[PDB]
Amino acid sequence: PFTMKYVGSIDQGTTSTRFIIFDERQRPVSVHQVPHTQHTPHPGWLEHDPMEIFRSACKCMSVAIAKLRQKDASFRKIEAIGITNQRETTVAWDRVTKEPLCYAPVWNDLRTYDITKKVTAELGGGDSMFASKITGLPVSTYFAAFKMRWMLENVPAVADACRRGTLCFGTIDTWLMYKLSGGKAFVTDVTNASRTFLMDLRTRKWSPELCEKLKIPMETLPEIRSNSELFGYVETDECGVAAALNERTPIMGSIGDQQSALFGNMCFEKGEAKNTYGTGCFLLMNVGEEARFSKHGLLSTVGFQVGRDGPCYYALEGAIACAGATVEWMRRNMNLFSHITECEKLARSVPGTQGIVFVPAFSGLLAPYWDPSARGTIVGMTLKTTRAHVIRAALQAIALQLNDVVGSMKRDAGLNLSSLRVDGGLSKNGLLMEIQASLLGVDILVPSMHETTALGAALCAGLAAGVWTSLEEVKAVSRRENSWKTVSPSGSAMEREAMIAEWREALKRTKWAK
Amino acid sequence: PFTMKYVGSIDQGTTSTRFIIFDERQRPVSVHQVPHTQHTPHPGWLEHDPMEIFRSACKCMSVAIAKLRQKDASFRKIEAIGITNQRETTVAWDRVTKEPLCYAPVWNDLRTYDITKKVTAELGGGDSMFASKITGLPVSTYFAAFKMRWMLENVPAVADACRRGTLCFGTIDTWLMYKLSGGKAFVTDVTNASRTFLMDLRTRKWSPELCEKLKIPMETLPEIRSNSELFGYVETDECGVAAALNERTPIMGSIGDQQSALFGNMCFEKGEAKNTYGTGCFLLMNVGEEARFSKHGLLSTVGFQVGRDGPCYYALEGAIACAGATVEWMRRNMNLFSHITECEKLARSVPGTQGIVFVPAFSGLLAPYWDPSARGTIVGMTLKTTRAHVIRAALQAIALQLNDVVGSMKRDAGLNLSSLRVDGGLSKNGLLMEIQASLLGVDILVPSMHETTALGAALCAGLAAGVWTSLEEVKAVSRRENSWKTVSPSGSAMEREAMIAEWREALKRTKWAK
Numbered sequence A, B: 001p002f003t004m005k006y007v008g009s010i011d012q013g014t015t016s017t018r019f020i021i022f023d024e025r026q027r028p029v030s031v032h033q034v035p036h037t038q039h040t041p042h043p044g045w046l047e048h049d050p051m052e053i054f055r056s057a058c059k060c061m062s063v064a065i066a067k068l069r070q071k072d073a074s075f076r077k078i079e080a081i082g083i084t085n086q087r088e089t090t091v092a093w094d095r096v097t098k099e100p101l102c103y104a105p106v107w108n109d110l111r112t113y114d115i116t117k118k119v120t121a122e123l124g125g126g127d128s129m130f131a132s133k134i135t136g137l138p139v140s141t142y143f144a145a146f147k148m149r150w151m152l153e154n155v156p157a158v159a160d161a162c163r164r165g166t167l168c169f170g171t172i173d174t175w176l177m178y179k180l181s182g183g184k185a186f187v188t189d190v191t192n193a194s195r196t197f198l199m200d201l202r203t204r205k206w207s208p209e210l211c212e213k214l215k216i217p218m219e220t221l222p223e224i225r226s227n228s229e230l231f232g233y234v235e236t237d238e239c240g241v242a243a244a245l246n247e248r249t250p251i252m253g254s255i256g257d258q259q260s261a262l263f264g265n266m267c268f269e270k271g272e273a274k275n276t277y278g279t280g281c282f283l284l285m286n287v288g289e290e291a292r293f294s295k296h297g298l299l300s301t302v303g304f305q306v307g308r309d310g311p312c313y314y315a316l317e318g319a320i321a322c323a324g325a326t327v328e329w330m331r332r333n334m335n336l337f338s339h340i341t342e343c344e345k346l347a348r349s350v351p352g353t354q355g356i357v358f359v360p361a362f363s364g365l366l367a368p369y370w371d372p373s374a375r376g377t378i379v380g381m382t383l384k385t386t387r388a389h390v391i392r393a394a395l396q397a398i399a400l401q402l403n404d405v406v407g408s409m410k411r412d413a414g415l416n417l418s419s420l421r422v423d424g425g426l427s428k429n430g431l432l433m434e435i436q437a438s439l440l441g442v443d444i445l446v447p448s449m450h451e452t453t454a455l456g457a458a459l460c461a462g463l464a465a466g467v468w469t470s471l472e473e474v475k476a477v478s479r480r481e482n483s484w485k486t487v488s489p490s491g492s493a494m495e496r497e498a499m500i501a502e503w504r505e506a507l508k509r510t511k512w513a514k
């Protein structure tokens, strides 16, 4: 009643794993990180060693716990652990060995492209969105199923293991939850399952039409649950993890990374949305207790579900391929600046782009204009154009794509974006947040506790273990402890429209590949 | 006589004047340069002070001569003087005062724009090319006639002097020979006269129809002579020039700057061309003894003429606005490199551009596809693209424009390109020269004695003075005494084809302004 309580969050990302311990204030009190290897066997491919990820996670936990006890020597244990992960990335493993059959292809890996084609033809009958009402997703290389298929066709040990009745497939939550539990648990959560291309969105249940249609035995699928409930206990002793925890610790949170950030930024109400700037962008809008579908090629997905049959919130999702990457490309590919802060400083040093548009579509346009053909392009240059204008044009362009994305989401959902919370690194660029607010015409909230993705999973775990009692208590503790900078709109109807008309014309000149 | 012979060359350019003394081996043995003031009363207006220009030339001659006397014991006198000049620039002066009535509008001056628009519509019925079978020229702000016309309409003293009959109009060649002369010569050479919009190419005589339509009296115009013959004698002693020359020195060569470079590069036979790679490019090809007109907006002009009523060689002329300028923008505006040596170093450091095209139409497209709407554009970029590729693409783009210019010339002229001689600062870029040889499929000759413009005028003078007796002897002395680096084609026709096909696609994306 006096001693502080803690919730652990495993944040398993594309390039590294972290364990963050939160206290009752929603403050990260201990953190450790461990990187894992980005295997690229052929151009366009990306693979991860699933045992390197498991071990990173256990290493992360034992180090973080150790540091925390130095800080609080009166702390016996963590209340619960939550998991949040890079989604779609699929592991295949043996039921008896408990070892992975092969490396895990990663959300953005392109090896499944041919399979993607075979699927669209032979099934959808050339319609990518054929199963969309069922799943929320267009046929794409990203989704699990198509990676499960590739492994079954192209990996000897995976094909064998299926016929023998020992094959377990799983997203990273599932893989982590399996190993952490000693092989005792085989579960996934609704957000992660919404990405398999094997789940029915409205019902949040596996679809026999698809597994069978896609030739994937149901036996290789884990049980689905909500994001906030008992999944299992931590029982493994890898890197002395169970001993560092002291008492058995339940895993009571599981949620995909983009949804975890929605939840960790308190986007509990429809119309609440978040954008995460990293190498790219991922914009998610909470749309309410009923699913919505897209006439603009956006993804329909689960936002969150707190508790077994607690209400389930749904969301729309969009993305931009190069955000941070564009900023870094200007630095390390083009020499336009050296120190990070020069980017903002140079773009502020000019009053606008004065003619030029820079469409930074280095790997094509996604969002509501799928076009793999589009490449990086600059138009309207004169001898007056400088690096300052080009940098400012890159930042405007990011904001312009997100404007387009939100325009679509509004119509596809028929709602107003009440506000946008942002996080990512690129959220540290004040000019970008200003441009973004003017174009969307809503407040942009920049939280100063910048561990919001990892907080999502801790909130799910802590809600189930009774650290926090309700979303209201969650919101209220957040207000008291974790401040945010708020960036309001400040444009003109005519300027906005002039930027957009100019941008629209530039887009027409970007088709290049093939 | 068998003592060393020396020929002098006044090179009167847009920003400076240089006097170069060549010996009989075509070696420049003394050089001096003096700038003149650039006056800009209104944007787009540029004007020169003709007296200042005259004085500079005189100063240049005496300093160059004095330097030579000091360093060469065998130098006694200059056999003859040749003059090469910035063309189109127009001097209005008074026959009795012997001084200018106003400053002289420069070739790139825009004040004649209204007049130009009026002329096309009023005498051209909206066709800018109406007079092009007579002049070889379109209606444009550059040509002398439109500057004369403008002075009469906006300069009271000129309109005044014109009335009294004391008016003298003249391009810089004419002005310099008059002053050097002491007022005893009122002459112009066929090449400069071809840039007035008042000469008939077929006859190489002033055109009454044109003078009447343009309303410039033919009394005000000087007499048209060849490039190489006796024009007059230096009789002034303005900067002690007469004192420095010592003996009587005849002025025996006069030729416009670009044509001078055609001559100094030995392009004596049809199909031989020169390109000057400076801020922009000026490509001229000798098309032979018969004028060739262009159905691609290329200019038809007089190439050269040795001797009074001697054979006259005609030329086609194209230009590109940004060449060296693009190199400078890349460094000054974009920070893509520091020392100009890095430009070629960085472009060499990648094997190609890997699908990007950089169209540097910063000030619109000229050449065979005039389009002032065009702007600087880059297409095809990916995250793998770097400054190295972008620098290389800029170089390719310069070579591709000239490839299209040459292409147009070949179709207009009905002849092949035999070889391309090169000069200008950017002809030091070895890779640019290699890309150009590979695109055109001809040898590129690079003079080590790079003062080609000054040499043209010195050869005209020296041919008329018997320092050299014929064009074959001129060619022999050049080959015997001065080194020519030869750059042979060294790509593949399949690469050529792809580069040209990407270039053509990119051009379509360049239209922006308005």
Ligand SMILES: Nc1ncnc2c1ncn2[C@@H]1O[C@H](COP(=O)(O)OP(=O)(O)O)[C@@H](O)[C@H]1O
Pocket (backbone or CB within 6 Å): A004, A023, A027, A028, A029, A071, A072
């Ligand atoms: N207001 C508080 N009430 C209770 N415990 C706290 C409080 N602030 C910090 N702690 C505990 O102190 C330890 C270190 O927290 P930390 O946030 O690093 O310290 P601080 O915020 O004072 O810089 C953690 O155990 C944290 O739970």
Ligand SMILES: Nc1ncnc2c1ncn2[C@@H]1O[C@H](COP(=O)(O)OP(=O)(O)O)[C@@H](O)[C@H]1O
Pocket (backbone or CB within 6 Å): B276, B277, B278, B279, B280, B324, B325, B327, B328, B340, B341, B343, B423, B424, B425, B426, B427, B428, B429
């Ligand atoms: N060593 C070099 N390597 C590459 N480019 C050069 C080098 N020297 C000069 N340049 C470029 O070539 C141009 C030279 O132009 P120049 O011929 O002197 O003037 P103009 O174009 O008026 O004749 C400059 O703009 C410069 O950018």
Ligand SMILES: O=P(O)(O)OC[C@H](O)CO
Pocket (backbone or CB within 6 Å): B085, B086, B087, B088, B107, B142, B257, B258, B319
């Ligand atoms: O030859 P310049 O450098 O005087 O330039 C004049 C050109 O003819 C313009 O087209």
Ligand SMILES: [Mg+2]
Pocket (backbone or CB within 6 Å): B276, B277, B278, B279, B280, B281, B282
């Ligand atoms: Mg030039």
